[PDB]
C-alpha cells in the first residue's frame, strides 16, 4: 500500500521482538563480531587465502545460498563447487583452527543480529534529518549503511557501548548522503556547509534590517574572503533546478518545453549557408597551387588553427611567399568575380 508505514512496522516489529539489552546483548554480539575478525585473519594465516575470500565464504554459508552469490555479484565464484572447496579446507582444520571456523560464522551471525536490533536507533536518528531533500526511507537506509560502518570499527575492549558509537557513524553517513544525492547537480560537502552558513547568515541579517540583505551584508557577516560575486554565485547554485516539465501559464495544460528554442540544429537558413559556402570554398581551393594553400586550408580548416610547423620541408620564406601571394591573387580575382564579397558571415 503506502511504503513508509510498511518498513516502519517492518523493523519496528522486529526490534519490538528483539531490542538489544543495554549492556549484555550489545556486549555479547560485539565480542562475537571481533572474534570473527580475529578468526578470519588466523584463518587467512593457515589457509593462505585472502581474508576477503574467507569473509565471503562464511557470509555465503550464514547469510545465503548460491542464489545470493549468483545474482548480486555476477559470476567469478562458482555457485556450488568453488565456495564448497573453501568450506572443505575449513573442516580439515583440526580441533585448533576448526574452532576459528565455527567462531567466524557465529560472529558473522552476531554481526547481523547486532545490526537488526539497532535499526530503531537509525530510524530515531534519521527521523530528524528529514526535510533536507531526501526521502525518509532513503535517509533511514543511508543511516542504516552508517550503522553497518560502525559495526566494523567498534572495539569492545574500550568499554563504551554501541549506542554512542553508532550515533556518530550514522550521522556521518546521513549528512554525506544529504550532500551527495539531494540535488540534481552534484555539490561537494564544502559547498553544502558553505550554503548552510550563507543561509544562516541571511537569517541573522533578516533579523533587523527589514531589508532582505543586499549581497553586501552577507559577505561581511560571513567572514574573511566573502564578496558580492561569491554570494550571488553561491545562491545561484543553491536554487534547485526547475521542472522542465512544470504547470505553466494559466495552469491548464502548459508544459514548460515547447517554448525553448534549439541552437545546434541548423535552421534551414544555415543549411543553405554551408551549401554555397562549401561549394564555393571548394571551387577556390581547387583552382590554386596545393603547396601552401592546402597547408593553410588543412591547417586552418581540417585539424586545429604555426607558420614554420605548417609547411612540410620547405621553410617559412616559401610559406609566407606563397601564402600571402596566393591568398591575395585569390582575393583579388574574387574581387573581380564577386562571389565571396557578400560575406557569407
Amino acid at each position: 500500500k503506502i511504503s513508509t508505514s510498511d518498513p516502519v512496522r517492518q523493523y519496528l516489529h522486529e526490534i519490538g521482538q528483539v531490542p538489544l539489552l543495554t549492556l549484555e546483548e550489545e556486549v555479547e554480539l560485539a565480542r562475537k563480531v571481533e572474534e570473527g575478525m580475529e578468526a578470519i585473519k588466523k584463518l587467512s594465516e593457515i589457509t593462505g587465502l585472502d581474508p576477503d575470500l574467507i569473509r565471503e565464504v562464511v557470509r555465503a554459508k550464514i547469510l545465503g545460498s548460491a542464489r545470493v552469490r549468483h545474482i548480486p555479484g555476477l559470476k567469478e565464484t562458482l555457485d556450488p563447487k568453488t565456495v564448497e572447496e573453501i568450506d572443505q579446507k575449513l573442516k580439515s582444520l583440526p580441533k585448533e583452527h576448526k574452532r576459528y571456523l565455527h567462531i567466524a560464522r557465529e560472529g558473522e551471525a552476531a554481526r547481523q543480529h547486532l545490526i537488526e536490533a539497532n535499526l530503531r536507533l537509525v530510524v530515531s536518528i534519521a527521523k530528524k534529518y528529514t526535510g533536507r531533500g531526501l526521502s525518509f526511507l532513503d535517509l533511514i537506509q543511508e543511516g542504516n549503511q552508517g550503522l553497518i560502518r560502525a559495526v566494523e570499527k567498534f572495539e569492545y575492549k574500550r568499554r563504551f557501548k554501541f549506542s554512542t558509537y553508532a550515533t556518530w557513524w550514522i550521522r556521518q553517513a546521513i549528512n554525506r548522503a544529504i550532500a551527495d544525492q539531494a540535488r540534481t547537480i552534484r555539490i561537494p560537502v564544502h559547498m553544502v556547509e558553505t550554503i548552510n552558513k550563507l543561509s544562516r547568515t541571511a537569517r541573522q541579517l533578516q533579523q533587523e534590517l527589514g531589508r532582505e540583505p543586499t549581497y553586501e551584508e552577507i559577505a561581511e557577516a560571513m567572514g574573511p574572503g566573502w564578496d558580492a560575486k561569491r554570494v550571488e554565485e553561491t545562491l545561484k547554485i543553491a536554487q534547485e533546478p526547475v521542472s522542465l516539465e512544470t504547470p505553466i501559464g494559466d495552469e491548464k495544460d502548459s508544459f514548460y518545453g515547447d517554448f525553448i528554442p534549439d541552437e545546434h540544429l541548423p535552421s534551414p537558413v544555415d543549411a543553405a549557408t554551408q551549401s554555397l559556402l562549401s561549394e564555393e570554398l571548394e571551387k577556390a581551393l581547387s583552382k590554386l597551387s596545393e603547396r601552401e594553400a592546402m597547408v593553410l586550408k588543412l591547417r586552418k580548416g581540417l585539424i586545429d588553427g604555426e607558420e614554420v610547423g605548417a609547411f612540410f620541408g620547405v621553410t617559412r620564406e616559401r610559406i609566407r611567399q606563397i601564402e600571402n601571394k596566393a591568398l591575395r591573387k585569390l582575393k583579388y580575382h574574387e574581387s573581380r568575380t564577386r562571389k565571396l564579397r557578400d560575406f557569407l558571415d
Binding site: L21, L23, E24, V27, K91, K98
Partner: protein, 98 residues
Amino acid sequence: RVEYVKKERAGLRLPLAAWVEKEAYKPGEILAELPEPYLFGDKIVAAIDPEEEVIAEAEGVVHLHEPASILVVKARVYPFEDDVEVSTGDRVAPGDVL
C-alpha cells in the same frame, strides 16, 4: 539453553567462571572447591562470585540479568557415523562434518 549466572551457588555451568576462581583451571582443585564435607562437570564454592566477568583483577565485567531462553530444538550430544548418505551430523567427539 540458559545463559548468564550470578552468585547463589555455582554448579555445572560452562567455562566462564573457570578462570575466575583459579582453583580448577590453574590446577585440579574444583573437587576441593566443595568446602568442608569432602573430608567426612562443575561444582564451585558455597557461593562466592556474583558477576559475568573475567577475573585478572575484577575488570572485564558485566553485572546483570540471567536469561533462560528455551530453544525448541532437539539437542544431540554423541552422534555416530553411518556412511549410507554422506556422514550426517557428527562423530563421537573428534570428527564434526556438520
